[PDB]
Structure formats: C-alpha cells, structure tokens
Amino acid sequence: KEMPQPKTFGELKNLPLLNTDKPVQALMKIADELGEIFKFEAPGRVTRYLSSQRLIKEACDESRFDKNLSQALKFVRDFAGDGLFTSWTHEKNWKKAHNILLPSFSQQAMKGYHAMMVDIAVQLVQKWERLNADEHIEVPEDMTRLTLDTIGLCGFNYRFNSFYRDQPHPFITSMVRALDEAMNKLQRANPDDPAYDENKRQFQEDIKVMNDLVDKIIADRKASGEQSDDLLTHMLNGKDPETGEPLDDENIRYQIITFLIAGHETTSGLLSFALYFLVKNPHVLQKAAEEAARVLVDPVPSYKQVKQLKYVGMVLNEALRLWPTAPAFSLYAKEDTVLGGEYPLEKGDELMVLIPQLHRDKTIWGDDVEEFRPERFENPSAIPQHAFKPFGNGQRACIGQQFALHEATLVLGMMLKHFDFEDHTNYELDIKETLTLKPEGFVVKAKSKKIPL
Template sequence: MSTEVKLERIPMPDKMPLIGNVLSVDKDAPLQGLMDLSRDLGPIFRMDMMGTPMVMVSGHELVAELCDESRFDKAVRGALRRVRSIGGNALFTGDSHDPEWGKAHRILLPTFSRQAMINYMPMMLDVADQLMLKWERLNSDDEIDVVHDMTGVALDTIGICGFNYRFNSFYREGFHPFIDALSHTLETCMLQRGLPFESQMLKRRLDRMKDDVNFMNTLVDDIVAERRMGGGEKAVNDLLNFMLEGVDKKTGESLSDENIRFQINTFLIAGHETTSGLMSFTLHYLMNYPDVLAKARDEVDRVLGRDIAVQPTLKQVNQLTYVQQVLFEALRLWPTAPAFSLSPYEDEVIGGKYKIKAGTFVTILVTMLHRDKTAWGENAEEFDPENFSKEAMAARPASAYKPFGNGQRACIGRQFAIQEATLIIGMILQRFELIDHTNYELKIKESLSIKPDGFKMKVKLRDDIVRSTMV
C-alpha cells in the first residue's frame, strides 16, 4: 500500500505581467523588503523574476533539509555571480564542482588552523593597538564614525595577517582607495537585476566599475610582485605564502597566478566587510543594553585586567566567553552575510509538501532564519546574549543558526573573524566608556553585506584604567 505525498503550492506575493516580482522588493533595501515578505508569507515563499523562479526559505526545519549537501549545492548566481568580476572562481564565488575551487580549499585550509590563529595574534594586536591609540588621542567632543573605523581595523588586520601588507587606514582621513573601489563595485553588482535597458541606464556606473576592478587588480598584483621580489628573504607563513608555495596533495598542482589574484581579492573583501559590520552592530547593541555592557565589561576587567599596557594573550581572548555571546547575538539579529543560496541536484520535496525542481535558485534568508520563533522563542526579535549560553545552544537545533553559511562552503575564516572581533571589542571595553551622543536609531545599509548606516558615537577613557610602565 503506497502513501501519496500531498504537495502544496509555495506561497507567492502578487506579481506583474512579464516582469513578475522584480519590482516587489525595494532596489535600495532588497534584504529588508524580503524580510517583510517573509513576515507576511511565512517560512517559505517563491518569486517570479522575469520567468525565473526563486524560492526564499527561513524556517529552521526546512533549512535543515536544504543544508543536506548530498541533495543541495551552493548556487553562485545573481549579485554573487556578478562579484566574479573581482573574485573569479575563488573560494567565495567559485562553484563547488570547479576543480580550482577544491584545489584552493585544500591548500588554504591550514591557514586557519589553531596554530595559524596563534601566529596571527601578534599582528592582530599590532592593528588593534593602532585603533586604541587613535581613540585615546581624540578630544572629548570628537565623534567616531564607527563603520569607518571598524572597516579600517578589519581591512588592516586581514592585510597584515594575510599578505604582510599595510593599508595604514589610521594614517588617512577617508577610506583607503581599495575600499572606495570595492564599495562602488559591490553596489553596482547589487543594482543589476536583469531589467530591459539596464546596461544603458547603469552605463556610467558600469564604466566606473571597470576602472575600479582594474585598480583593485593592480593593487593585488603589486602585493604579489613585492612578495616574489623578496623571495630570498625568510618566507612569511601567511595566506599569500600558502597561495604561492602551496601544493595540493590530491592533484599535485599549485594555484595559477590568475587564481591567486582572485583569492586575494576575495580574502580582502570577505576578511573585512563582514567583520567590520559585526563589530559595528555589536557596539550599537552594547550602548543600547546597559546591563549587557556592564556584564561584558566586568568579564573584560576580570580576564584582561585594568592595566592597558599589558597586551592580551590568545588564551585570555578565548576566555572572553560573554563578549563572544554578545558578538554571536549581534550576528544573529544582523548576520553580515545575510543570505546564501542553494540549488537541488534533482527534483526535491522539502517539508514533506513543497516541491522544488532541480536547479531552482533557493535562498536561505538568514536574517529571518535567526528570527524563527519556533527555534528562538517569542522574543526572537529582541537582543539577548543569553541565547548563546551553553544551555541554550545545546537545546537549539543547529539549523537555526547559519551566519557563516553551511558545510564545505561555510566561511573558511570564521574562527579568524571571531578571534579578531573578540580581541578588538575586549580592548575597547577595557579602555573606554561608550557614549551614544546622537541617540542613534539603527538603520541598515545594504550591499553584498550589511552594516549600520550613519552610526556615530563618542568615547571617553575610563577613569579606573591603569597604564603601568613596561620594561
């Protein structure tokens, strides 16, 4: 006796003739528009993008099925595919079945091992100290552009740790030209939606994007050339060294020069974009939740001490467990990689009732997955670091929290990012009082990642800090 599965139609918003749902989402805030649709339509809905179906999913039980890598693979399409103009077939934008992706993944995985994290610590401290010194020298009425400074510290950190290259972000007024070029390129990638006459309407942006890509490629080529010219010196055991010298044990091959360029661009993008947003959101929430701030500061004082002349150790950073809970909770409400996409190898049925055809573009809307009340409770929209206590984490399904993607395509640098963010937030709390002088209300700036928009604050050196004379 066979049991026939009763399929249900996937909910869908109203659409227009020919263009379908292309205009259903605000082009300036597509993520927030999709979040609103998810609130209205539920944990799964579909859209018609000029005849091409797209399915959006945010329910953790459905996501658990989608994260089965034997059934679904990462889909590199839409804006992410357009980022190939700078990332090519590197780790973030390459296809899983591309031999170059597998080769690079195997070569570069050791650069994020436990030993690698130990090796990166002095360089992370070097850059963090520059940020602390800048803030210590501010006048009492000077305000801080939070995203600017978090972007600078994150870019400088991946620059020095990954490639022994100094962007020197704290020795210039605005952003480094690489950031300006990158921001414009990502914005242009996001603006393209495949509409008629789009290339003509965006011609000026697209022309500038070509110049920006050339600038970024030239900078990266210079980094590689400088390393090769210094080939007789003692090798720096960083990402770039693994790219230049690493050999894949499976194939016996090394990375091509073109792929090395793509990988460097990718690490410079991913290594600062998401981490800077994470730290910015975290500072916002700390200022808005005094009890959380007090608890985090108490932990910092207990673990790091009050003598700011004594540099934190990696062991101490790993002991800042409540600070990490705050970071993870900020990353829950506003995951800086707010979505990732998959497609089924074959026709699939998920949730026992929703049919998805092979090759369909399925996007996991991480911002709404992290607000799924069936996993996070009725207060899922509220900021609460206790969501990441050991007890809460043990009781929650793993599929409910996916800020770093999934499986073999999960962010390779996630441990690096958390170590960096914990160190920097810890050092800030050790030294400074945070002042919300504008009563800032959170506004989201969307690109390929997300950050607070227009977030300014002031700081004041704590009265109870100690600065010993180190010999």
C-alpha cells in the same frame, strides 16, 4: 500544496519588489507575512525564499543541495573570479584552494595572526584615547579601518594605514565602486541605454586597478623569497594534498581580492552591530565589561586571554543572530526532491536561505526573538543543527569564521577594557544595505578608563 507568493506587477511578476534601497529588510517583511517559504518570480527566473529551521535543515543536506551562484555572486565574479566565494563546488580551483587554505584559517592558525591583529587593535584604542572630550566616534567607519587593516596585514603583510587617512586607499576606492556597480546591476532592467557605457567603462577600470595592485603584491613576494607567515606565503608554497598541485598566480590574486572584500564592511558590520546592541543594553555592556577587566590583565591581550572572553563571544553570536552581515545564500537541487513533505523541486531548482528570518524562528529561539540576550549562547551546543547559520553551510561554509571571530573578540575585549560608552544621540537604527548590512550613522562617545597599553 500551493507555495505562497508576494504581490505581482503583471508581466514583471515579483521583480519590482527588489527595486528598493533595503531588499533584505523588504524580504524579511514578506517572510513575516507569508511564513516559512515563498516563491519569487521574475521574467525568466524563479527562486524560493526559506525562513524556517524546519525547511532550512533539509536545504543544508549536502547530498540534496549544493551552493548556487546567485546573480549577486555572478556579478562579483567579474572581479573575484574563481576565488573560493564565487566558485562552483565542481570547479577544480574550488577544491584545490579549499584544501590548501582551510588549515591556514583554523582556530589554531589564529595563534600565528594574533600579534598582527593586536598591532591594528592597539592603533584603534590609541585613536580613541587621543580624541578630545567634545568629539565622537563614527563606529562603522572606525570598525572598517580596523577590519581592512587586519586582513591586509595578516593576509599579505600590506599596511592599508587606514588610521592615517580620511580618503580610502586607491584599491578600496575601486573595490567599493566595483561592489556598488555589481549590487546596482541587480535592479537595472536594461543596462545598455548609453548612460550605462560610463558605468561599464568605470567597472573595467576598477577591475584593472584591483588586478594591478594585487598582481604586483604577488610578483614582489615571489621575487624576494621573503617568508612572512601570512596567507600569501601559504598560497605561494602550499600544495593541494589531493591533486598535488599548487594554486597559480591568477587564482592567488582572486583569493586575495575575495579576502579583502570579506574583511571590509562584511566583518566590520559585526563589530558595529555588537557595539550598537551593547549601548542599547547597558546591563549586557556592564557584564561584558566585567569579563574584559577580569580576563585582560596584561597591557596587550594574549591569544589564550581572547579565547577566555566567553561572554564577549556570546555578545558577538547574539549580534550575528539578529543582523548577520552576509544575510543570504543560494542553493540548487542536486536531484528531483520534495522539500518539507509538501514542495516538489526539479533538479537545478534554486533556494535562497534568508538568514535573518531563520534566526527569528520562534519554534527554535522562543517568543522574544527581537531581544538582544547573549545568554542564548551560554552553551552553543544547545542550538539545533542548521538553526544558526551566519557563516553558511557545510563544505561551502565561511573559511574566515575563526579569523573574523578572533579579530572581533580581541578588539571588542580591548574596547570594553579601555572605555565607557555613551549613546549620546540616542541613535535610531537605520540599516544600510550594500553587499552587506551596517548601522548607518551609528555614533558614540568613548570616555577613557585611563588604563595604560
């Protein structure tokens, strides 16, 4: 049949609909109006936005569809290169890096990172214990300090020392400005008016800053023979069991840059949304706080204790349901195929999965999809295949999922053990869109339960 399409702007087709500060939220409203699938046309390109589990369960069939690099990922590839996130599945360096790194990101590998994660989580708790009575917490700012420092220390034994600064690390200044330039180029019609030579100049300088610190990190480690159990040691020593080859130093740099992007606001967003929903749902906060107090009986949490924070895990899954912090991914058709018995696609045709809309499919979740209810995840096995996809799909799924959830469960556990929280401004959710999503200006007050560390 005829696929629905949103409003057009003459020869510009649908392109101006993404000339907005909040394109994901705009696409969600278009999905609300048009339903499970809509065509999006621009001069020279056509994609289809999927919102229903019924169609997304077919999109997630790896025999029929593979990961596409969206324009967003193609612009990020200028500095993330052939790292896992910005590689095609058919690139030799994708399969090598995947085989070498995947065992180092397992639930079981988190035992080795736990001590380092505790180091940064304790720095967060001590910061909040040390605030004066009249002061508040800038939640996304503090969560980003935690997640960046955690990936720096577990990733390559580097301390960003985010709790010791207002001003970002020079690497982060360049990474954030490079990510901004990549996202800004999406809505940039003609990028060659002489105003955009200065953007392009700044872009090349930020790439050089990122390449220089990371190449130096790798070079320093190769020299010292120092064997830290971090991802960088794993990458310098590891061999792909298929090819028998290791990663080269350039590819290792791209992997580190990719991990630092991922571990920044994409991961801290989960913690910012989780705390937002907890302060807006005080009975849910109380239930999560009762679990944290019952389970976290030692001054520092153990790996086994974090694994026993079941309700805190449910809280984080329910935050990922409503506001997944990497809210879309792109696929292409491996062969001519028919989607949902109705939508014929040619080989190469592109799909975009709109994850926030998938997570609001009433046929899966029931009518009250806007409610924050962690009890939806009492038994995560009960969720049908391809209904809950905040970490993407199949062999191209998030490699960091167990790392992100261990980090988030540990620190949210400790926060709920150590503090009562107040929504002292009655904060109005305002979701800022970058490469990720965050509750912009989210602030709370934390009152110590005066429990020692």
